[PDB]
Write a structure and sequence with these properties.
The complex is a heterodimer of chains A (742) and B (83).
Chain A (H helix, E strand, L loop, with lengths): L5 H7 L1 H18 L3 H7 L10 H13 L7 E7 L6 H16 L4 E5 L8 H4 L6 E8 L6 H16 L7 E5 L1 H35 L2 H27 L7 H32 L3 H28 L7 H33 L14 H12 L1 H13 L23 H10 L10 E3 L10 H16 L3 E5 L20 H10 L9 E5 L6 H18 L11 E3 H35 L2 H30 L5 H29 L5 H27 L7 H33 L23
Helix pairs in contact in A: 2-9, 2-12, 3-9, 7-8, 8-9, 8-10, 8-22, 9-10, 9-12, 10-11, 10-12, 10-22, 11-12, 11-19, 11-21, 13-22, 13-23, 14-20, 14-23, 16-18, 18-19, 19-20, 19-21, 20-21, 20-23, 21-22, 21-23, 22-23
Chain B lengths: L3 H15 L14 H4 L3 H14 L6 H4 L5 H12 L3
Helix pairs in contact in B: 1-3, 1-5
Classes of the chains: A mainly alpha (742), B mainly alpha (83).
């Protein structure tokens, strides 16, 4: 290791760069609110603006002149006794208070107040009544969360009568409640992650000073990442989401401590070999700074590949995670190296307290090298056997199950399900827009035909329109019925103010939150299109909005999203690996090992969550787990391959043996720390974040146990000379003459 | 053809890496793991190291019966002398 270059500059300027990093962290944390706060007040929309459901709902609002945003909250009144006159007075007071605040409540569909449609809102047993409130701001946005909070405060403000409790639930309320749950659980998840890191680094290094300095580096890097991301979010320069905040905190802390483990372990190995403090630090830098920078490039690129996606919950993981991980890696490479440099001059802080465990790892590497084909076949089979979870894997999108049951939205859903069906609480808005005036008897009979056709669609339980104020009432409207004040009120409740469009409230028979409702949306659109056929108003628009349409858009987008993001992250990680190792075959080997490890991770995570936990795996879990696995597993394989490349000089097979012996403890410690920090997400109240963390933790446990330790070295041993193509490498070097006796 | 001492010294140097046993503790009259506590998988490590950096051939079939360093050095010589 020549004492020069960037390592020299970091060593000589260690104190100035430590001070600069500390000052940057302080500025970022004192000029901008914390990450949790900014994530709360700069959350990103649940659904993309260009999605057909969002534009359909916006069109509904602007045509009916009621609302301008895609967010609805269900207010459910549940009484022990049947809802009588006192319940009506309480509900009317709630509606009046909601209408008194237009900053958060855009519109209220007073279905229950009108006696014409009152029985539509009431439950069949007559114990609960639901009312729709279109709030302000698109679902999942910070404005929508504020509107949901305002609605909840308004509901709690009005004194309820004896009995009859009012709950606020619904999709926007569900998103607000998921932010609330994340705010509740972020402290405990960070505490658990830090405790796990403290304990496991204490087991690894067995030095109190070393672990304190490692946590100093980790805390400073994580605070720098949180400060940078908060600075970006507070200035609206990037989007942000609850998933982004939680995943970024955990990824930042875990990757920062992984880089700390890499640098510290390499420095300790260099010290144990016999190199002095300066020489050991220079060897550590020249052998690990490049691999840490490449690890960070892979993580940042894999996360950034989620920016080229379409849904906001992944666009919010694209740029924020990319920049957060990039600043974590700069913090590691600069601040951690500087701290190692300054601590080297002080006492024996970073001197290893015990001989590093190589004999076992050297033995394992020898076993891998001598018999690479059997070991590779065994690990390939043991990692592909995970793919047995495909016949039975489910991707339930129901956020009800992934949130605490004590939250306001979950309690509202629970109260609704006690008197209504599960589908009623998430209705669907359907329209047809007639170019001419729609208040005609022929038009009304066409509307009745449309309602009947949508009702006849399988999986649809209730249709509500001007012709059917409730679920179920040669249909002709006499012209004197048009002048009925009750019928005029029903008109203004169900028709456009200019009389050119209708609205249909659709309640499914099954879960509207699952692929059944996803197919129901297309069936409803087809039924409406065939019903409007052969009518004087043929050619109208079939804008349909609501939960099931939104998740139909999200489901198709998520399939294409996972495919394209996986392909792009895979290709970009391979490009980074080719840049680092300058070996296309080695990079492809890293790609293959990580992909197979990901298959095993999928199998194990699906098995645990869907069979012993009992909770179906969330859809966004797949994307985040795939991205993080392709990042970190490739990072570990890259560290091993870089060590192998360094050790090639003494031989190819013995190079693998020496590399495995030298990096087994380091990679095992780093992988255990990362995996355990990710399984620390299991304590998070967001069961989707828990699923993401457990999936990634199990995957990286599998990686650092079998994949990087057997599959990658066995593949390297099998390929031999071709493992470093196109770089001209040799097999076992020229046989040296037997040395003279000493 | 290298004499006894050359291969003994080379194997001692390799053993210093596999385990940490001092080179002068590797003498032909004493034995392997039943004497020096060098596991059969560490014997595989010796085999791989000597394949690589000395360029000799040692298969797994003959490695099982290699129970003294005298036997392994005799095997090296017996593979060496005939070109």
């Amino acid at each position: 290791a020549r004492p020069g270059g960037i390592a020299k500059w970091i060593r000589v300027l260690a104190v100035p760069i430590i001070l600069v990093w500390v000052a940057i962290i302080a500025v970022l944390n004192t000029v901008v609110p914390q990450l949790d706060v900014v994530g709360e007040m700069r959350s990103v929309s649940m659904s993309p603006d260009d999605a057909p459901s969002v534009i359909a709902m916006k069109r509904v609002g602007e045509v009916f002149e009621e609302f301008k945003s895609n967010s609805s909250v269900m207010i459910v009144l549940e009484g022990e006794q049947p809802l009588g006159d006192e319940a009506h007075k309480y509900y009317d007071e709630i509606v009046d208070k909601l209408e008194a605040d237009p900053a958060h409540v855009e519109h209220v569909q007073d279905f229950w107040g009108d006696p014409l449609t009152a029985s539509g809102a009431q439950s069949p047993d007559g114990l609960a009544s639901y009312v729709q409130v279109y709030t302000r701001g698109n679902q999942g946005e910070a404005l929508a969360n504020e509107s949901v909070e305002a609605v909840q405060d308004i509901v709690e403000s009005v004194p309820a009568p004896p009995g009859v409790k009012a709950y606020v639930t619904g999709p926007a309320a569900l998103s607000a409640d998921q932010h609330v749950a994340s705010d509740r659980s972020v402290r405990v998840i960070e505490a658990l992650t830090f405790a796990v890191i403290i304990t496991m680094l204490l087991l690894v290094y067995r030095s109190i000073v070393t672990v304190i300095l490692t946590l100093v580096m980790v805390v400073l890097s994580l605070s720098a990442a949180r400060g940078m991301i908060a600075f970006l979010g507070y200035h609206e320069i990037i989007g942000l989401s609850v998933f982004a905040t939680n995943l970024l905190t955990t990824l930042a802390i875990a990757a920062a401590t992984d880089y700390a483990i890499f640098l510290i372990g390499r420095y300790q190995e260099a010290r144990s070999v016999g190199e002095d403090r300066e020489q050991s630090y220079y060897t550590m830098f020249h052998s690990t700074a490049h691999v840490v920078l490449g690890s960070g490039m892979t993580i940042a690129g894999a996360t950034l590949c989620l920016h080229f996606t379409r849904m906001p919950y992944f666009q919010s993981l694209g740029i924020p995670l990319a920049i957060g991980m990039s600043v974590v890696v700069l913090a590691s490479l600069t601040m951690g190296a500087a701290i190692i440099s300054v601590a080297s001059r002080f006492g024996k802080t970073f001197e290893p307290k015990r001989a590093m465990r190589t004999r076992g790892w050297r033995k394992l590497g020898a076993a891998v090298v001598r018999w690479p084909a059997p070991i590779l076949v065994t690990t390939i089979a043991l990692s592909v056997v995970g793919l047995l979870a495909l016949p039975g894997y489910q991707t339930n999108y129901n956020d009800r199950r992934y949130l605490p049951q004590d939250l306001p939205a979950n309690t509202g859903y629970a109260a609704a399900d006690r008197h209504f069906s599960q589908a009623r609480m998430n209705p669907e808005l359907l329209m047809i827009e007639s170019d001419h005036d729609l208040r005609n008897s022929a038009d009304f009979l066409v509307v009745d035909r449309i309602a009947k056709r949508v009702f006849q669609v399988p999986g649809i339980s209730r249709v509500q329109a001007i012709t059917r104020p409730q679920g179920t009432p040669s249909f002709y409207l006499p012209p004197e019925t048009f002048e009925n004040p009750d019928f005029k009120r029903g008109m203004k409740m169900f028709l456009s103010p200019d009389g050119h469009a209708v609205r249909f409230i659709i309640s499914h028979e099954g879960d509207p939150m699952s692929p059944e409702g996803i197919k129901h949306i297309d069936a409803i659109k087809q039924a409406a299109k065939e019903a409007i056929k052969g009518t004087p108003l043929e050619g109208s628009k079939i804008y349909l909005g609501g939960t099931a349409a939104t998740f139909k858009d999200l489901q198709e987008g998520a399939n294409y999203d996972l495919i394209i993001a996986g392909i792009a992250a895979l290709c970009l990680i391979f490009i980074i690996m080719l840049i680092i190792t300058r070996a296309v075959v080695a990079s492809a080997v890293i790609v293959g090992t990580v992909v197979i490890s990901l298959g095993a991770s999928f199998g194990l995570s699906v098995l645990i969550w869907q069979h012993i936990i009992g909770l179906e795996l969330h859809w966004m879990v797949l994307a985040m787990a795939v991205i993080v696995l392709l990042a970190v597993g490739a990072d570990y394989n890259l560290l091993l391959v870089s060590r192998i490349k360094e050790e090639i000089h003494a031989g190819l097979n013995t190079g693998i043996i020496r590399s495995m012996g030298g990096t087994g403890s380091v990679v095992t410690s780093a992988g255990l720390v990362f995996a355990f920090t990710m399984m620390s997400m299991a304590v998070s109240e967001l069961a989707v974040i828990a699923q993401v963390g457990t999936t990634i933790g199990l995957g990286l446990l599998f990686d650092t146990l079998v994949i990087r330790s057997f599959m990658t070295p066995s593949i390297a041993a099998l390929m031999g000379k071709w493992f470093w193509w196109p770089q001209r490498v040799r097999q076992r070097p020229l046989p040296a003459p037997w040395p003279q006796p000493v | 053809a290298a004499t006894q001492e050359e291969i003994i010294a080379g194997l001692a140097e390799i053993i210093e890496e596999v385990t940490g046993i001092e080179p002068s503790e590797v003498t032909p009259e004493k034995s392997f793991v039943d004497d020096l506590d060098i596991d059969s998988l560490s014997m595989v490590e010796i085999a791989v190291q000597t394949e690589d950096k000395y360029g000799v051939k040692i298969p797994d079939e003959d490695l099982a019966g290699l129970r003294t360093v005298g036997d392994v050095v005799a095997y090296i010589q017996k593979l060496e002398e005939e070109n």
